[PDB]
A paper describes a structure:
Here, we report the cryo-EM structure of the SGIV capsid at 3.5 Å resolution using a block-based reconstruction method.
NI displays a hook-like shape, NII is perpendicular to the capsid surface, and NIII is parallel to the bottom of the capsid. Each VP14 protomer contacts two MCP protomers from two adjacent pseudo-hexameric capsomers. [name], encoded by the orf88 gene, was identified as the anchor protein (P5) of SGIV.
Numbering used by the authors:
A (entry chain e1): 8 to 52
B (entry chain e2): 2 to 463
C (entry chain e3): 53 to 309
D (entry chain e3): 362 to 463
E (entry chain s1): 76 to 170
F (entry chain t3): 73 to 169
G (entry chain t2): 75 to 114
Amino acid sequence: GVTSGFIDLATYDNLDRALYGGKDATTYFIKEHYPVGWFTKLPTM
Amino acid sequence: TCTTGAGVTSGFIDLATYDNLDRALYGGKDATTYFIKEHYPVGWFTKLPTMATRVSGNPAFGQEFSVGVPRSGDYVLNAWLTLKTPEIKLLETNRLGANGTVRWTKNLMHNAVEHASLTFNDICAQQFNTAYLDAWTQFNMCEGKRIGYDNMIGNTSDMTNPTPAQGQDGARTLPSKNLVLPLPFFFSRDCGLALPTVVLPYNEIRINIKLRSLQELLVFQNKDTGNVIPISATDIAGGLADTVEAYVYMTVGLVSNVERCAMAGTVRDMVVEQMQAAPTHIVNPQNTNNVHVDMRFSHAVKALFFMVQNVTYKSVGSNYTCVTPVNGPGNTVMEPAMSVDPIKSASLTYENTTRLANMGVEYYSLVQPWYFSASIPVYTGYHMYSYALNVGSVHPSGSTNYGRLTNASITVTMSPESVVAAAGGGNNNSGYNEPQRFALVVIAVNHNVIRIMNGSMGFPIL
Amino acid sequence: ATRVSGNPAFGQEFSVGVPRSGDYVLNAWLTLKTPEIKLLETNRLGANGTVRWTKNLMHNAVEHASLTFNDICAQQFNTAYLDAWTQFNMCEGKRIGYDNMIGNTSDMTNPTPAQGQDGARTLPSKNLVLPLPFFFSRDCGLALPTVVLPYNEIRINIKLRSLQELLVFQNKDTGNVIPISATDIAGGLADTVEAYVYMTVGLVSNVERCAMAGTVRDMVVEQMQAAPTHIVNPQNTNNVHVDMRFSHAVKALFFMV
Amino acid sequence: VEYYSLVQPWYFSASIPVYTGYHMYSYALNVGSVHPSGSTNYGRLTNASITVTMSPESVVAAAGGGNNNSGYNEPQRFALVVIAVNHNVIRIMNGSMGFPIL
Amino acid sequence: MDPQLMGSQTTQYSRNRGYGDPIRGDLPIVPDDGGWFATRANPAHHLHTGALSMIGGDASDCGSTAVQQLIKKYEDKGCNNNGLNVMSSHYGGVM
Amino acid sequence: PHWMDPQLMGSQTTQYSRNRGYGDPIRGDLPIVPDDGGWFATRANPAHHLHTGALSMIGGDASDCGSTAVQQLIKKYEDKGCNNNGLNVMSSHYGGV
Amino acid sequence: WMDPQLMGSQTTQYSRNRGYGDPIRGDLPIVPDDGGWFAT
């Protein structure tokens, strides 16, 4: 279930605020994507 | 065309294939490119090793010795302990007679090194022992260094080979070779976390190491029935050398004068990881098939490493299997006929709220390490459960603090192999000839914050 | 996972839905318990007959494994792709664990003689776990916004293989393989199999859980394209030309005979 | 064949196979990297083909007649399989999932 | 047939509603329209409202944010002369 | 620069009594003001005698989210007026009493 | 260098879909689908 997930989510304190939290805190599960160059490769004698 | 040896036109048709789908991935004015690595300057520094001066007595087996960390440097980032093993010479007048062999214990190092602690002034900041060492080295081991670590800490197929008496075919002498054990600490985990010895002029840094008696380091096996009995001074020639020489080598660094005085007089916060062990719990599978252990932790725990350790004989160590090892053919130790982890299933409860159900042992054995670690153990045992995405990462990940959490319990179900090996009746060289006993150990790894200010350290959160 | 389509059996296909009440599903693995194999004295090969589990017990018996949304065929993997990926992108240290957890324990791949012979070893029965390689399982940064997807139906379809080709019946003298039969082994061939699908979900604080709602999001994923197999006869010709046809931006080509 | 067997996995992969076969040719710098690298879409490309020349061991093992415990005691058959790996884009909006490019 | 035609019946939830979170209701998402690969799903029988209304609700008397004032008012706070300057644990809950 | 500064430099979190464990993890303890007096009046401290529960973060129904935006969306979207091809359906309310 | 390679301009290449068209009479002129949802 998710009751245990809620229970251990509720455990928040000053150390947890120091480590996690914050408006600018980058979250996982969301990866930023940036474009790269366009190129190609091939072997050659 | 031609497509000669030095052909390049073949790539132009590949480059031409670009429409409506590769525009999202490649291209753009802000797109970075390979083959052009951006270069940025770094700091100016040097590093060199340094002996650490002893402060409390001299090293000796079964005793505790303490060494002060050498200050006056700039940063301390490696520390290791080197120790020269004694020389073992079996005697034909031993108690076991001809049917008797002597060998070094499995994982010679990580044994006789326990309660390794680091203290600031008169307060402890970190302390580790055998179980934590074994679990960490089995779960966060970079490949390619496994053979080197084995040669460093023992089990090199030479120290742990059983040797019969002098009058028998096997009369080889156990070599006396020095061994090195690195000390895992918060400043040794990463180069980013280094001890500011320049910023700590008032604190005194000390390291305490307590060894183990030589009686509980040598396996005195019976050749035929596989019985382990404690060793004696008269058993081997030359007696027992209680005193041994051991050194602690530490690596210090130096920084440029421009930055040495630039960061003086500042308040610094560091995030570190430390360990904490639950009290041992004797397990008797004969009476009950379930065992519950109460976990009472304080800070933001990151992972829980647990296993059941066979404790029938004090001489044998690092044996997390229901059956003790016995001598085999060719004067080499061999695993018995049956060798399985005593744990069958486990679960976690948060005050009558089962967070993790009765999952199989293979879950903790293989699924968790494959996803949230850097290595999978090769021996039986060493189960884990990690609240974080990556255990080895120093950067904090998902975790829970047990301070605000109610009483948490862990439940384990025994195994038929363990419950049948608990009683005796085993045949010769079967390992479980004598009744077997088991104990359960729980280890937790948590985070903490250390503050440096006014030329001193401390824990702002305790 | 709550199974709602069919039942797990060898040679049949079963579907399992991906439930909500998480926030980001990021891991899925299938667990399967192998049966107990005991060779009989009435086998056609008689004394010169050995039975052993096939190589890669897991990575076999699991083909055409598909992930779909609503009713659209989204992604698929099969045996050859699994073998190529686990042979090329395997991380050292975990190699022993994987080769022990997908079968290949040297206790199932070792031939066992008949009951009357010297080796009366029976093939052990245990459970094995195969982690399904999906685009969300590839990286922790790619996870399904399950709360943000309440109007679809995420399904995982697994099609097992029959037990006839999961067991190798070798001849001890001539080294020949013949199909297994129910009467060859004791207890028959259990068509029904014991298996489940486990998934790992993540939970997040509501203040951003429902702050991320009502937005458009873009993901980049990796799929395969398996060309139809081509029968090759080296006796007639030594060089073979095969024409391929793929659609999207191919990253690599794996092949083998 | 040793090129695809050893050289390509040495540079453009995280591991080298420990068994025979498993030949790879990758257009990308890193196969296992999730982030896109160099690649050529085959949809815009015209027809493409692969030519494979087989070893004499295969042709002499295709015919049977091998002695006991030799493997080729019976005629042997072969089949070539080709697999490619491609990128794609998935868009999530209005509680729905679908490809924006079809 | 008059008694049958009299009255109405309860709504019929689709099978997709059973996969939602029972404790906390799922997020409100506006369905999309269009004549090209667009589903006109109905939130009324496609969404789960959760249980955050029967047991949940920031009441004037009840509520964690109502117990907060009590805890802060009855907390000793400051610096003590017989301990180690006990720090005030902060509940909050802003991620 | 006294000795043993680290022990006396810092702070420690509040330690709760054994009675706090019995509280409901999901729903916080009801706010009850303690009493005082010299006749059987226990001066228990709510700070370490109360359980805040897990509802504080999940609940709130600020503007969107929670069990009010979905209520409004469902009420707006579900159709009303006759049945035609059917037998009529009534709107089920999900409010609390 | 690179002058012979970059001086020229290659001819257009058609996808395999064009190979199935009618050779005698061309396909009807129809605009393609444009959009961000299942649009070719």
